[PDB]
Each structure stands twice: as C-alpha cells, then as structure tokens.
Symmetry: D2
Subunit: 244 residues, 4 copies
C-alpha cells in the first residue's frame, strides 16, 4: 500500500519521545517534511540529528501563550499528529485542582490550539488535510486512579468528532487512535509490576501490549489518503480489549 | 413505584433554575432533605419559599477555593445530582483559551470537587449512596459550535464511569443522564432559531425536544434504589436521537 | 413515582419464569391487565393462580405459524415486554447450524413477529404505546462460548433502534435492557461454577450478579411514561460491567 | 506501508460484484492467491479473466450443506474477507419470516460457516491469521426499512468480537469494516433516489458517498500485519456519519 505522505509537511507534537518520536522517525523515512514539537530541548536536539531536515520547536504545549507564538508561524503543514500528553494518576478521592488543570491543558487544550493553527492554514491554501489525535483505550473504559486521564481521553475522542464535523466540508479529516498500554516512559511507569500489568494483559485476547510500531502504523494509515472516508473515528490499537 | 428518597439528604448543584430547580422541587415532594447549590442567591431565595426546609447555598462551583470552603461542613448528604453547567458556544476555529477554561472548570472540575466531598462522608459513615451527573446527548454526538461543550460532556461520561468503578465497592453508584435540547434558559439560547431547531428536530424519532420533567424523572430513577444495578451508564433522554 | 401502568394491557413473553414471571407479577400487582405468554403449560397455570386475571397463552414463540394464530387475535394491547429467549452456548468452532437457527428465531424473530401484532394494533387505534426488549450485557461485550447468544442480543439492540426510528412518529417507544447475570433458570446453568462466576464478578464494580427485581424495575420504568423521552436505548443492568 | 499480503492464500466471499470483486482485484494485484466465491457463475467467469490465477467457487452461501461441501476443499487459506450479504429491504411492520430467514442465513450464518473452516485450518497448521467482516454503518445507526439488514450487521459486529476473543489466543485477528452507502447495484437500489441519497449526504460530514477503493483500502489494511494490534474492531468508512 502506498500511503503517499512523501513531500508532505507534517507536524508532530510530543515528538521528544515514545510514540511521537517513533512517529517522526517513521514519518521521516517516508519522505515527509517533519516539524517536531516537544518540551525538552534536549530531546529535539537528538531528533534533528537523527532525522535531518526536520524543524525542531521547543515549547510547553500546556502554555497557551508560549505555544500560540512558538508555532504561530511554523509555515505550511499538511498533516498533524496531536500526541503530546501528560498522565497524572490519582485515585478519585485524591484528585486535585493542579492535576486536573495541567492534564486538560496539555491533554486537550493544546490539541485545540495547534489544530486551530494547522487547519487555519490548510483552509487558507484551499487544500485538504488530515489530523490524528492520540487518544486511548481508557478513553472508553475507565481504569483506577485515572479519573482525570480517562476524562482527557474521553474528552479527546468527542473533540475529534466535533473537529471532523466542522472541518468536514473543509476536506480536512480528524481521527483518533486508541491503543492499550505502550511500554514507553509512561508505560514503563505504571504497568511495571508483573501482577499489575498481568491483570491488564488477561483482558487482551492477543495477550500482549502494543508497540510503538502498531500505533504508528494506524497513525500513518489515518494520515494517508488510503482512509479518505474515515473521519471522526476511534481506531483501537489495544489487542481487542474493548471487545470483551 | 416507590423511589424512597424521602428523609434523604440530597445535594443538587445548579439548583437555581431549569432542570436544577425542577429537580429540587420534585425532590422536595418526595420528602427528601435538599441542599440546593447555585450561583445566584436570588434563585435560592424563591425556591425556599416554595420548598421550605431546603438549605440554600451560594457559591461559584467554578471556584475550587470558594467551593472547598462553602461546602466543608454541608453535613452528611446521601444523594448527589451534579447539574450546574455553562454552555460556551464558539465555532471550532474561534475557540478561546478562557472559553475552554471556564467550561471545563464548571462542567467537570466542580463535579469532582463536590462528588469528592459527598463521597468521603458516604465512605466515612460506611453507607451506600448514589450520584447523578447531567451529561448530554452531544457527549457522544458532535454538533456545530460545540467543540468545548461536547468535550466537557464527553469528559463527564468517562468521568462517571471511573467514579462508578472506583466508588463501586463502597456501595455508591454513579450514573449520567444525556438529554436532548431542553427549553430552559440554556435551551432558549441556541435553539431559539426555528431553522436551527428544525434540523435538530428532524433527527429525533419522537419529533420533539425533552421537557424538564423527563430529565428529572430519569434523575430520580437513577438516584433511587429502583436502579440499584445500574452504574457508570448514560441514560439518554434525547427522543431516539442516538438510535439513528 | 407513579408510572401509570395500571389499567393498561401488557403482553409479556417468556412469562413462565425468571425476568418474565417477576415482570408479570410486578405488573399484575400494579393494576395492569396482563397476557402472559410462555412455553411450559404448568408454568402458565401457577402464574394465573399467582395473579388471577392474567390471560395465559401457551405457545412456542420460535414457531412463526403457531405464534401467528395463537396471538394474531389477542386484541388491543398497550405495552409489550419481549423477554422470551434461549441460550445455546457453543465454542465458535463448535457452533451448529441448528443452534444458530433455533437461537435466532426465538431470541429475535419472534420479537419482530409479536412487536408487529401489537404495534399494528396501536397504530390502527391511533394511540401511543411502548415496547421493552430484554437484551443482555453480552450484547456489547464478547463472552466465551456465547458466539450466537451475544449475536442475537447484538441484533436485539439494533432492531430496537430501527423499531424506535420507525415507530417513533406513531408515539410508540422501543428500548432494551442489558442486565448482567441473573441467577435464574438461565443464569444458574453456566455460572454455577464458582470460578466461572468470580471471573465475571470481578469485572463488576458493584461486585454482585443482578436480580429479577433489578431488571423488572428497569422494564417497568421504560414501559412507563416516566421515560416518555427515552427511546432506542439500551439500559445497562450489569452493575458497571460495560464501564470498565 | 508494506502490507505484505503477497503470496498468501486469501478467500473472498461475494467476489462476484461490488466490494467483493474490487477486493479480489486489489488482493490479486498485490500478488496474493485469492479464492473467489460468489453465487452467479457468470461473475466469476469474467473476474477470472480479469484476475488470472484466482480460484472461483460458484455457490449459494445461504446453504449450509452446499457450502460445507463446496468449501471443505478450499486449501490452506490464510486470510478471509466475509463480504457476501443480501439487502432485503422491508418496513418493520411489513417484514416477513422469509426475508428474515434468508438475510440472516447469508449475511451471518455463512460468515460463521466459512470462518470456522478457515480458522480450523489455520489452527491445525499452528499458524496466525486474519479475518475481515464487511459490516455496515447502519450496524450502529438505524435507517428506515432496514430492520432486518441493520440487525444482521448489528449481530455481525458482535460476532466479530466473540470471534476476536476466542480466536485471539490463536494468533488469529478478526475485525469488521463499516462503510456507508456504496454506489453498487445494491446501494443503487434504495439510494438511487436523488432525494433519498441527499438526506444521507447531509449527515456525512465529508459530504460524499463512498467508493469501493475506500472500503477495500480498509479491508486490506486490517488483513495486513500493519494492524496486528487491532482486533474485534469495527473500522468505519462512512465519511463521519457516526460522529454526528
Ligand atoms: N505510553 C503508553 O503506555 C500509552 C498508552 C496509551 C496511550 N498513550 C498516549 O500516547 C501519547 C504519547 O504517549 P507516549 O508513550 O509517547 O509518552 P512519552 O514517552 O512520555 O512521550 C510523550 C511526549 O510528549 C511530550 N510532551 C508532554 N507534554 C508536553 C507539553 N506540555 N509540551 C510539549 N511536549 C510535551 C513529552 O516531552 P517531555 O518528555 O519533554 O515532557 C514526550 O516527548 C499520549 O497522548 C498518551 O496519552 C500512551
Ligand atoms: N439546557 C438544555 O437544553 C440542556 C440540555 C442537555 C443537557 N443540559 C445540562 O443539564 C444541566 C442543567 O442545565 P439547564 O438547562 O437546567 O441550565 P440553566 O437553565 O442554565 O440552569 C443551570 C443552573 O446551573 C447554575 N450554574 C451554572 N454555572 C454555574 C457555576 N459556575 N456555579 C454555580 N452555579 C452555576 C445556574 O445558576 P446561575 O444562573 O445563578 O449561574 C443555573 O441555575 C447542565 O449540566 C446542562 O449542561 C441542559
Ligand atoms: N438469567 C440470565 O443470567 C440473563 C442475563 C441477562 C439477560 N437475560 C435475558 O433475559 C431473558 C430471559 O432470561 P431468564 O433468566 O428469565 O430465563 P429462564 O429462567 O430460562 O426463563 C425464560 C422464559 O422464557 C420462556 N421461553 C423460552 N423459549 C420460549 C419459546 N420459544 N416460546 C415461548 N416461551 C419461551 C421459558 O419457558 P420454557 O422454559 O417453558 O421454555 C422461560 O419461562 C432473555 O432475553 C435472556 O436472554 C438473562
Ligand atoms: N451496496 C451498498 O451500497 C453497500 C453499502 C454499505 C454496505 N454494503 C455491504 O458491502 C458488502 C457487499 O455489498 P455490495 O455493495 O458489494 O453488493 P452487491 O453489488 O450486491 O454485491 C454483493 C455480492 O455478494 C454476492 N452474494 C450475495 N449473496 C450471496 C450468496 N448467498 N452466495 C454467494 N454469493 C452471494 C453477490 O452475488 P450475486 O448477486 O451475483 O449472487 C454479489 O456479487 C456487504 O456485506 C453489504 O452488506 C453495501
């Protein structure tokens, strides 16, 4: 299958590591023009060396003001991967104002800002486009101590569909991909304990967790015009978890 | 059907008017003890004349600080209806930082704050209970100029299920209600325009919008032990809208 | 909550036992005139004794032709609970064409056949009515060795929605119930195995299986005009199962 | 993206026309060994001249016995596209036993008969595999005069999951695709009316009906190892019909 991302400008948030990092590499090899947006300059330093030609951008996506002008004129992009996200785990009787606030500020608000920027250009150029929001499996099934997290994720999926519906006649697409645990900095944090991640794996018919590869493949797919009739969706990449 | 809410302590946020008010009234006739929480003291005053023995409470539920302390000693309550909510409607490319910010602060964060309080006592007293979140039909279906509202609403549903699962073993139940347009001040904002309401009404199999009673009847049902096996759900009151 | 079922004619299939018989019983006691339809003769005869006045109708609802003349002339019915159904559990690779056939003509087709008689009755009479379909928890989550069962249920859910859509403008509602296990005839069969139960009880935030009263409550609520704005729904009575 | 379907045994039902045809043509081009199965002989005769190498089977998949002796000798197939279906469009009140009978023995029963054989064969070789179930978007949303057809699909979505759950541990993935109206003779039946097609285009955010590349794009993507973390899923191809 020819995905046809070559020669396309592609913005990727949270590019510093995990799924975003891999997603930028994977996008580079394909011959896309890549803009890597992340929080730790240290990470974007290494990236650009890995994948030459990719414009790095340091910024806290949780900062409206620092983001609006740190990308306000990042030029013409064609495809966007909203993947920067932080996960603050609290049992429900312990959730605090700060946790809540940081999470939605990065988890969803940024998504809205960048998507606003990127889409605004696309429309101006009178050109089609596409966006992928990295949601989650807990975006439709709750997990203990993730009341805020799952709220951002469930929040994300509905935002995805409004964007789809409003941007629809602008020929731009919006989809989300919802993987199970990924053994990233994030993944190698909570689900470290065997029994911990064991009880989770017992719910997955394929009996294994996702890899960056898997979720990157549905992203690439959802960016590609191979899925030109798919928009406002939640493509699971959780090994069947939602099915039972 | 005997709901048996009588003599029960019941908090209702956003009780000043619309579904909140009506939900207060109906809760009164049942013989339950009611705490009506609202922003405008004026709203609470009149209520009290109607429903004597209803402890009114003024506060901005969008204020963590103003809320944590005006509720620190609201006594032992046994039932909760989170209904206070604001609707900030902006097309997707015009969404603002504050619009995002207020909406989530009221429509979601408040819910966790109050619910946190009420639940601690329930757990503390070693007592069963129940919580109702007035979500919405757009919590799972997008509408124009509702990017943030639907995302709150979408958020609320996932928040409900995490609440349900964690408080589950504490014999507390959590459920949401997702009504279609209700001809309240809120409803009487967007759906004032005929053409607007026509296209929406064209979608509803029952060919009419909901009434406050309908949503109130689902709320009482969900608070009562008549639905003691339902928790973490989304009881629609959208006249069939989700079905087709 | 006065539901206002008293004085209305309610047909109840699978009335012989379980949810169907607890449901007959609840309606009788509320002043409803009931037609109880079941398979076992001796089953119908005690109900009538348990509830003087109910009209018993013995027939195999998996038989189009029997059903048609054993019910075709039943008269002006106002409500309807489709509750009859069979559970033939086979591993996917052991599914039989007989199991498929029997399971779908009872668990579903008969739902179309009776719903046609009634609905047509109301529609000709130019009077509102309401229909309750008893689906299941597994209608939205796969369970082992339930390849056909869940599929009937799965088909059950959607048929409700199509029925809803079509009968909507005839002031007739259609909703389904989706309880978790109920330790009835059906329930105390496959899940008598304490390890088979736990496996399921662990996924239930309320940590208990359902009870007949629980889905009868849910049925009556939906048959009632309390819920005059709830159509096309699938009401969980799985104590949080779908939620996590 | 390297699907890597080249050289593997792929069985396609309903390969005679529409999506089944297109899926063979595209599965062939990728160097795959496709066993084409359809009901009208004259169709496979032409396709076979279009795609030299394929191995057609003329048969009525509604027939358990014929199928079971027609496909018992089908060779170690590695992938599977259950596409065969029939649209018997009747208003809910006018639905007939006959139409329900056929619709569910072709659209569903067959899916179950072909799928056992392949799996069985797949498991005996101790080899992984993939299945794709061509469902529909009315599988989750109702359309008038589609009570039976939407039902089959609805059941289809759940079959997919039980299949995905029991087959999961055998390295065999199962997934469904849910396209909107395709302008096949089938879709060119109840969707040819300018007015009937218009009120559908109005609900589709992307503002177009679908063409058979799109669904074939999703099938091939789900059959490929590129999506080996996706199973028990329902990948929509309706240009956002479901989001709003
Ligand atoms: N990891 C898994 O287990 C898993 C599972 C399901 C879903 N997901 C989702 O997949 C996406 C990425 O997860 P992951 O595994 O890639 O996590 P990760 O390894 O922690 O990577 C996240 C990246 O996003 C960046 N980032 C976070 N907040 C940012 C901000 N405010 N501004 C700029 N950059 C920011 C991080 O930069 P710094 O390191 O500099 O902060 C980091 O490079 C998320 O939406 C996450 O919710 C992950
Ligand atoms: N309106 C509809 O058609 C509709 C439809 C579907 C769902 N819903 C939902 O159902 C619930 C009730 O809506 P409604 O139609 O009854 O609305 P309404 O007529 O606007 O009343 C909502 C009440 O909540 C209060 N409130 C709002 N924000 C508050 C805040 N930050 N702090 C304290 N009090 C606040 C308002 O009091 P003040 O005026 O004094 O602030 C008002 O009395 C909400 O959660 C709403 O989202 C409404
Ligand atoms: N119990 C469970 O755990 C459970 C859980 C979730 C949902 N449900 C659903 O609830 C409904 C009933 O379950 P249940 O536990 O009440 O079952 P039950 O105890 O086995 O009784 C069901 C009744 O339906 C009758 N019946 C079955 N086939 C019939 C036919 N072909 N014609 C006429 N009558 C027929 C049975 O009569 P005979 O025995 O005389 O045939 C019996 O009286 C079904 O839709 C089932 O799918 C059950
Ligand atoms: N048509 C649309 O607009 C549309 C829209 C949404 C979803 N879908 C779905 O997409 C899939 C195919 O539909 P389509 O548009 O391709 O339809 P189509 O143009 O009617 O072609 C379907 C093919 O299936 C074959 N077939 C049907 N019954 C069969 C049987 N019993 N045994 C063997 N072969 C059989 C037909 O062969 P003969 O007719 O030559 O016997 C025909 O070649 C289905 O699952 C359908 O539900 C279609």
């Amino acid at each position: 299958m020819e995905l046809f991302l070559a020669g396309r400008r592609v913005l990727v948030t949270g590019a510093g590591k995990g799924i975003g990092r891999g997603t930028v590499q994977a996008l580079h090899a394909t011959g896309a023009r890549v803009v890597a947006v992340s929080r730790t300059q240290a990470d974007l330093d290494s990236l650009v060396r890995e994948c030459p030609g990719i414009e790095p951008v340091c910024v806290d996506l949780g900062d409206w003001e620092a983001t609006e002008r740190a990308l306000g004129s990042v030029g013409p992009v064609d495809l966007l991967v909203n993947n920067a996200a932080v996960a603050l785990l609290q049992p429900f009787l312990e959730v605090t104002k700060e946790a809540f606030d940081r999470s939605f500020e990065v988890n969803l608000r940024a998504v809205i800002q960048v998507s606003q920027i990127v889409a605004r250009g696309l429309i101006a150029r009178g050109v089609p486009g596409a966006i992928v929001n990295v949601s989650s499996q807990c975006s439709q099934r709750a997990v203990t101590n993730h009341s805020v997290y799952c709220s951002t994720k469930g929040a994300l999926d509905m935002l995805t569909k409004v964007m789809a519906l409003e941007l629809g006649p602008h020929k731009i697409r919006v989809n989300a991909v919802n993987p199970t645990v990924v053994m990233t900095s994030m993944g190698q944090a909570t689900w470290s304990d065997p029994h911990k991640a064991k009880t989770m794996l017992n719910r997955i018919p394929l009996g294994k967790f996702a890899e960056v590869e898997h979720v990157v493949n549905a992203i690439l797919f959802l960016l590609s015009d191979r899925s030109g009739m798919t928009t406002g969706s939640t493509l699971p990449v959780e090994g069947g978890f939602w099915a039972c």
